[PDB]
Symmetry: C2
Subunit: 44 residues, 2 copies
């Protein structure tokens, strides 16, 4: 916790900027969900 | 944590509000140091 200071912080939690920015990885590409055309069935 | 259901924050630190209010306990009262008077010496 940066203890070389003579007046250190309580816990590391006050030494961070919890940033709520949500990032995600590149993510699989979806190819065949929609290549195909759709038959609007209206019955079973 | 609070994994109760579906979607979870990440960690406790992301389920908490980190205040910066600072508190001190009852401390101790200082009685002696100030009771007496000073002889403004200007020399050894």
């Amino acid at each position: 916790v940066n203890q070389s200071s003579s007046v250190e912080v309580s816990s590391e939690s006050y030494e961070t900027i919890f940033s709520q920015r949500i990032i995600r990885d590149l993510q699989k590409e979806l190819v065949v969900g929609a290549l195909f055309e759709e038959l609007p069935m209206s019955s079973k």
